[PDB]
Design a protein around this ligand. Structure first.
Ligand SMILES: Nc1ncnc2c1ncn2[C@@H]1O[C@H](COP(=O)(O)OP(=O)(O)NP(=O)(O)O)[C@@H](O)[C@H]1O
Ligand SMILES: Nc1ncnc2c1ncn2[C@@H]1O[C@H](COP(=O)(O)OP(=O)(O)NP(=O)(O)O)[C@@H](O)[C@H]1O
Ligand SMILES: [Mg+2]
Ligand SMILES: [Mg+2]
Ligand SMILES: [Zn+2]
Ligand SMILES: [Zn+2]
Lengths: 462, 467
């Protein structure tokens, strides 16, 4: 469309320090990790394995590896990775979470100094090496990223510039944890399917005490934050397992941390007397309703608040709205969930907030109004608040104190919330009337049975 | 040699991506204000040039008299991450080489920057409209330089300069070299910068996100003021007033100076609690100033500054987290050096959440210490507050405007004021009727500090001790 040529004009160029600048957006390391998990999901990965390869010769002592069997990346897609702001996912009606062409870079540079990405597709295996260590050691102001490609069957380099490929592979072997083509190929074989991605973030960030920010020792099945948990802390904020469990409102991709599947869950289904309220979005209709799902978290009443999902991705968690902002038990314990499309509210640079604060607060006020409506609809006054709560084992006067673990109260709580579960093979969510490692439809029903989704009672506002 | 290797390159959409970090449009503006400050500007004028042919209806202009930029610096503007400010023992607020771009792209589609210095005047045109209209996936930024004396182009590629100026005239609000030179002459001094963000963002209702009509002396958010909303979040005037813990640069919004203030000076019974941050020495201490906001009890909470720049404000810590009135109304201030905590991408949070929470817990402990020290609750918190005019029970209601109360409050808080000539912060002994006028040192009744050469008497804040 340009009327002339702009080859001689200056271009806005990235610098090695802008990688750290980009990383600083993640005050939530779990958001930084969620960026890679979102990339894996958008890659149509059926599972993402988030494990740690111990490496004492690397800062932090271990590499953080995100292995997914998604669509992978061809050489052109891998090149487009380092095209900041480029996102083929940013398309109308897209269900993909990536739109900013920035999540992978920001999250990886927040988690660790460098990240080496191995991706595989139809007939090509590409390694993307974003080595901040390389830049620091060689005084590179630009952001140079080797992108060697091999033929996935012959392992022969697929390139037009042999010298370019040689330099790329030499840099990878020199500054990466994989010092030989044999090690590079070994990391490529960790993608067993025809396509998949293996994002390895190494030289992790260290706290002031020299230890990594991510604690993987206190719980080998979890990636925790290396920091003492005050009773007021939220598992989704101190435990990456808990965070990834509710990281998506419609979790299809399985998430494994250190080889142990994360029991992904739908708060829409894990609640007592859930109810959907339709809210008409003037912005949504102008650019084209929302579904405010409310329910009492009987299992843990202190883990209440609104869980705002944006394009099925968790942005705001435990967001207190409506009467919850007051001092009192009114609407205490009620959990709200909403999947906000991108036409309504877009996420922030770190995808831990919403760019349009005005409309985000409008949504929060609407959700508070609907939360009060839900509280009236369930009409706990018909029962009474204290009697209602102690019915589920909350005998203690304390609010954050978990309910008594008597089998009576356990059955009382469980009898109301159906125990949904995802099949490890067909990825569909099932139900049972009345497991950590694995489960399939046959263990009630079969993998071909249509997904009988949770139909929620519909309420109305006013 | 790595000339053959791929380079991580920016894309036009990355401008919006970078902009999305600013969920606080006032933080987006504060980015440009911080750039002006770092430029050693003694004055930044944040005015609105009405332009109905541009999206938003008006142009947002940030005119400063700082050091300006030479052609090399202007080129380094579009080098994302490039920041010469990022140096040790540096009072500069810029470190990320990103603030200008993120803030400008959050505020509006495009921004045209006019900077002047030694005899070279440079115009940086980051036109997202240009890229949208001509299908550029890159980020092409014209950077023509003229000789500030002869206004003759200073360039090596005449065709490059011609293309740059053509793009500026074609996609910018200034369609002629005459208009460009007018905007350059808006920098009267030998050096200065004029950042004009135009094609502003529009809310759903089609109006700009910034309200410059409700109060012609302020840049408000075009959105109602819920009682809970803070002036620093609905009024850029107040936000810029408390935007720096040590304000030197004068902020003028629409031509009217912003009455910059130091909460340290503007508090009752201020006390400096020194906190020895182990992180400071580990990465190699802080000063937690606490005071009761007698004028506005509800405007309490910690005001955490980072390198003299406001990051977190009204941050409830310590007993304030409890619903009780303990430590209610106490404002806290801390200028966190960059060595201790660094800010987030948007400069509205802190990158190290763990250590930021450690600092918040320390500030809460020191806040309880200050509460006990002043012993106002010991003598009776309700009577203490109603003595200053809060005879009512609602914590959000302001104090009674009776002159008796007004005097009771103003007596405790000494009145400080900045001279509009030497930028030195003077303190006066009696109540002042006055918006910020053109007050200068010469008009100070106190003879010890009736001069612009008189040394600035810094505040003699008492130093408390913890434990
Ligand atoms: N695991 C993966 N599998 C397949 N493609 C991937 C993977 N990770 C990254 N990519 C590709 O690389 C691009 C850049 O990643 P990223 O920096 O996360 O930007 P984005 O995902 O497009 N958008 P956002 O997540 O909103 O910043 C993606 O958009 C994908 O095209
Ligand atoms: N008003 C100004 N006066 C002088 N120099 C300026 C001005 N605005 C920008 N610059 C220069 O342009 C650079 C880029 O600005 P910016 O994108 O704000 O990055 P930064 O200010 O270096 N760091 P940060 O503000 O933390 O992102 C600055 O660092 C200055 O060198
Ligand atoms: Mg992504
Ligand atoms: Mg700046
Ligand atoms: Zn199945
Ligand atoms: Zn003076």
């Amino acid at each position: 469309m340009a009327f002339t040529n702009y080859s001689s004009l200056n271009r806005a160029q990235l610098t090695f320090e802008y990688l750290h600048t980009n990383s600083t957006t993640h005050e939530f390391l779990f958001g930084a990790l969620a960026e890679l998990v979102d990339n894996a999901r958008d890659a149509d990965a059926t599972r993402i394995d988030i494990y740690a390869e111990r490496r004492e010769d690397l800062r932090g002592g271990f590499m953080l590896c995100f292995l997914d069997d998604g669509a992978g990346m061809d050489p052109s897609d891998a090149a487009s990775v380092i095209q900041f702001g480029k996102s083929a996912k940013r398309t109308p009606e897209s269900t993909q979470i990536g739109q900013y062409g920035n999540g992978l870079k920001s999250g990886s540079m927040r988690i660790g100094k460098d990240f080496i990405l191995f991706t595989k597709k139809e007939d090509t295996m590409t390694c993307l090496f974003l080595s901040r260590t390389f830049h620091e050691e060689e005084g590179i102001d630009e952001v140079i990223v080797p992108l060697p490609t091999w033929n996935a069957r012959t392992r022969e380099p697929v390139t037009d510039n042999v010298e370019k490929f040689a330099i790329e592979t030499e840099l990878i072997y020199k500054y990466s944890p994989f010092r030989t083509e044999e090690e590079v190929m070994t990391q490529f074989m960790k993608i067993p399917g025809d396509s998949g991605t293996l994002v390895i973030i190494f030289n992790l960030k260290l706290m002031d005490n020299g230890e990594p920010e991510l604690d993987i020792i206190s719980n080998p099945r979890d990636i925790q934050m290396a920091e003492t948990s005050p009773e007021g802390t939220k598992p989704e904020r101190r435990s990456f397992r808990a965070y990834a469990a509710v990281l998506y409102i419609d979790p299809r991709m399985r998430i494994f941390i250190h080889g142990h599947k994360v029991q992904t869950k739908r708060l829409s289904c894990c609640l007592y007397k859930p109810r959907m309220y339709k809210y008409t979005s003037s912005r949504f209709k102008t650019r084209a309703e929302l579904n405010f799902v409310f329910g009492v978290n009987i299992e843990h009443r202190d883990l209440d608040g609104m869980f705002i999902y944006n394009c099925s991705r968790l942005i705001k968690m435990y967001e207190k709205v409506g009467p919850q902002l007051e001092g009192g038990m009114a609407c205490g314990g009620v959990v709200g969930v909403v999947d906000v499309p991108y036409l309504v509210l877009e996420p922030t640079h770190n995808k831990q907030d919403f760019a349009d604060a005005k409309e985000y607060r409008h949504l929060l006020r609407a959700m508070g109004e609907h939360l009060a409506q839900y509280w009236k609809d369930i009409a706990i006054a018909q029962r009474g608040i204290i009697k209602f709560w102690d019915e589920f084992g909350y005998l203690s006067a304390n609010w954050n104190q978990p309910p008594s673990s008597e089998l009576r109260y356990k059955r009382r709580r469980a009898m109301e919330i159906p125990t949904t579960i995802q099949c490890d093979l067909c990825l569909k969510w099932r139900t049972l009337p009345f497991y950590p490692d694995t489960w399939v439809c046959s263990m009630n029903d079969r993998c071909e049975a249509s997904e009988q989704k949770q139909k929620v009672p519909l309420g109305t506002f006013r």
